[PDB]
């Protein structure tokens, strides 16, 4: 129904400052409280969307090209509005995507379209966007090192926290 759907207090890609999120038929725009550049995403590059709880709630947007847009700070009540937006405007189902909370460190590391996902019994424990990765190295058998540059390529999401992610190592049998 509405022309614009607006949502307040939303963080874009681990932004330190929240901003205003506006949804329209032709795509989405985010504008920071004062300091920073506005972000835009055309409807033609909206391929999918996931809804889950994060450091409030997060809408993760999957581009038709390889990439992820993270919008968190939504309230739980915001789901039904968002689901209508993505379905009616973006031809997309907003998938409810629960993450694993058991605290296990074994499962499956899967290389998807835009992210390296570690799944625990088919539910994601965490996701690493390819755009954040500085290097991928064989560290032995059967070990792969995924390195970040929080401080060439820069890993902004790795450095958004006070505790900056430097490296993750996976044991993956059968590539040695």
């Amino acid at each position: 129904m509405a022309a614009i759907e607006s949502f307040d207090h939303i963080y874009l890609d681990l932004s330190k400052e929240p901003g205003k999120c506006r949804f329209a038929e032709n795509g989405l725009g985010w504008k920071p409280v004062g300091g920073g550049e506005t972000f835009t995403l055309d409807v033609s590059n909206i391929g999918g969307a996931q809804w889950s709880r994060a450091a409030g709630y997060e809408v993760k947007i999957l581009q038709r090209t390889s990439g992820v847009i993270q919008l968190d700070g939504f309230q739980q009540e915001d789901y039904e509005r968002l689901a209508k937006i993505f379905k009616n405007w973006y031809s997309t189902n907003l998938e409810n995507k629960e993450h694993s909370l058991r605290g296990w460190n074994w499962g499956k590391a899967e290389f998807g379209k835009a992210e390296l996902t570690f799944n625990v019994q088919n539910r994601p424990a965490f996701e690493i966007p390819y755009s954040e990765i500085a290097n991928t190295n064989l560290a032995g058998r059967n070990e792969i090192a995924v390195e970040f540059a929080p401080g060439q390529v820069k890993s902004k999401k790795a450095s958004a926290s006070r505790d900056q992610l430097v490296e993750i190592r996976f044991y993956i049998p059968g590539t040695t």
């Binding site: 681990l14 994060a54 450091a55 058991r102 460190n105 996701e127 006070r162 505790d163 993750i168």
Partner: protein, 113 residues
Amino acid sequence: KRFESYKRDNQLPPKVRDMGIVIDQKNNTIVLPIMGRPVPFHINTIKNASKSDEGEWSFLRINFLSPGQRKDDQPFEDASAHFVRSLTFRSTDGDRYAEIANQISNLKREAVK
């Protein structure tokens, strides 16, 4: 054998929202901030934790229990399982990371009693 950190989102410690490392001694769990997401790791999954300093940056390396860290044999009932072996964080708070490493080591030792 079977352990479990949390069952529900609302059981996560409230300081999780600051995207920082959180120790939840209560649930035998540490919570690591990965790409905007608070990720729990149970203490029974952890091998050791080490602090180090290079310049103005301090480093926290957590090593996990995994095959090799081979044959034979494993109690995960998942022979082809992939494992998180380790992850490294960096910060300027050298004293905070020293505390974290000690809490984890101290937690681990009860876990192996």
